[PDB]
Amino acid sequence: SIEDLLARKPKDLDDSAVAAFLKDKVVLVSGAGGTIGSELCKQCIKFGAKHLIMVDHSEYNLYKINDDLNLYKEKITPILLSILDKQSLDEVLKTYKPELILHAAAYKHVPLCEQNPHSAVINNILGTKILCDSAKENKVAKFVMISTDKAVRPTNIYGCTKRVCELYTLSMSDENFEVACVRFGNVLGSSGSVIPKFKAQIANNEPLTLTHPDIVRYFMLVAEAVQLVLQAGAIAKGGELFVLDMGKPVKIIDLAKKMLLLSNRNDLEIKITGLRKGEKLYEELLIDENDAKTQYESIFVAKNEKVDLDWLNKEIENLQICEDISEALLKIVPEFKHN
């Protein structure tokens, strides 16, 4: 399958390290029923967590991960909740006292975030602030946030919100609360992504819609990205921004052609539809030549400076009432070049 062909197959997956990190912990996963969150849930069970708290605002997604894990039902708790509800979220953290939060809840579709910039800011930045503030206040030991290559020199609302989330969480890290952020590229077959779209086009006898003949992305299997995230979390001392080695770039045109070849539907045309607002032809390569090595060849540590939280909290207040979100974001992230 195409997934098989584009897998990273990292040489440096380390089950025993992850097991050491997770064994007998109470772990809360935000966005637990999502593509990444569901895999984080599954790996938390595999690697020996004592109790998994699954937080998701999407009832079907929560239903589904809870059902998927039914054999482990005594060790999991489905919490049907938005992380924007600070009071209820605080009650959850007090009741279950997680030692580790794995934060995988966000809105991620670049076009939808361009069309709904306020909701992107609220869900991504304010949601991350609420969850982090609650985690730190309730003495959660370690907080790992999932991030994206789109956060680097961002050209879209989504990527810029994720950069703000990095700045916020990393600036919260201290001697008691250890924060790691982990950046990676596209996950093969994730919700609402290009592979399922092309599968659906082929099955409906529709031409494949390709944005641009030269567009490329970096890809990893969800199980690879997630285990590497957990390895990074395990080694984190707090305040690290990690980046994953995604291997070679994949041209989307080659992906489309391979999918057509694999389903013997070279009858179908590939139609070029054009780059969208804020969409990059080539996302930024994740690992910089000066990033620090770790013991895992797939994981590097990128440079980051804390920002003052008083300043950042004031700017986050501004994002919620300002006229021009794009302009407000640029004040926080001066490298933001919107579309």
Which residues bind to ligand UDP, rule: CB under 6 A?
110, 186, 193-194, 197, 209-211, 215, 217, 252, 279
Q: For ligand NAD, which is the closer residue by CB, 177 or 218? A: 218
Q: For Na ion, which is the closer residue by CB, 126 or 225? A: 225
Does the annotation list 217 as a binding residue?
A: yes
In degrees, rounded to 5, the angle at the alpha carbon of residue 287 between the alpha carbons of residues 282 and 290 is 130
Contact 113, 120 (CB under 8 A): yes
3-state secondary structure of 219: strand
Among 184, 242, 296, 300, binds ligand NAD (CB under 6 A): 184
Token output for 99: 């030692």
Binding mask 181-220 for its own copies (x = CB under 8 A): ----------xx----x-----------------------
Among 19, 46, 48, 82, binds its own copies (CB under 8 A): 82
Does the annotation list 153 as a binding residue?
A: no
Give the whole-angstrom CA distance, residue 229 versus residue 145.
9
Which listed option, ligand NAD, ligand UDP, its own copies, none, makes contact with residue 36 (CB within 5 to 8 Å by class)? ligand NAD
**DSSP bridge pairs for 28:** 53, 101
For residue 50, how many C-alpha atoms fall within 13 Å in the half-sphere facing its CB? 11
Q: How far is the CB of 168 from its own copies (least distance, A)?
A: 21
Residues 14-43 that bind its own copies (CB under 8 A): none
Which listed option, ligand UDP, ligand NAD, its own copies, none, makes contact with residue 110 (CB within 5 to 8 Å by class)? ligand UDP
Which listed option, Na ion, ligand UDP, its own copies, none, makes contact with residue 211 (CB within 5 to 8 Å by class)? ligand UDP
- Catalytic residue check, 280: no
Work out whether 109 is an interface residue with its own copies (CB under 8 A): yes
Does the annotation list 209 as a binding residue?
A: yes
Contact 57, 80 (CB under 8 A): yes
Give the whole-angstrom CA distance, residue 14 versus residue 315.
40
Contact 241, 183 (CB under 8 A): yes
* Residue 25, number of CB atoms within 10 A of its CB: 19
Does the annotation list 215 as a binding residue?
A: no
- Catalytic annotation, pick one of 150, 258, 293, 314: 150
**DSSP bridge pairs for 183:** 147, 243
| 244 CB-near residues (< 8 Å, 6+ apart) | 182, 183, 184, 185, 220, 225, 228, 229, 286, 298, 299, 300
Give the whole-angstrom CA distance, residue 57 versus residue 262.
37
Q: For its own copies, which is the closer residue by CB, 5 or 200? A: 200
Whole-number Cα distances in Å, 282 to 149, 190, 194, 218, 279: 10, 19, 15, 9, 9
Binding mask 55-74 for Na ion (x = CB under 5 A): ------------------x-
Among the listed ranges 64-72, 139-147, 225-233, 303-311, the one in contact with its own copies (CB under 8 A) is 64-72
How many residues sit in the footprint of Na ion (CB under 5 A)? 4
Among the listed ranges 11-19, 108-116, 140-148, 262-270, the one in contact with its own copies (CB under 8 A) is 108-116
Work out whether 284 is an interface residue with its own copies (CB under 8 A): no
Contact 53, 105 (CB under 8 A): no
Binding site for Na ion (CB under 5 A): 14, 16, 73, 76
**Active-site residue numbers?**
150
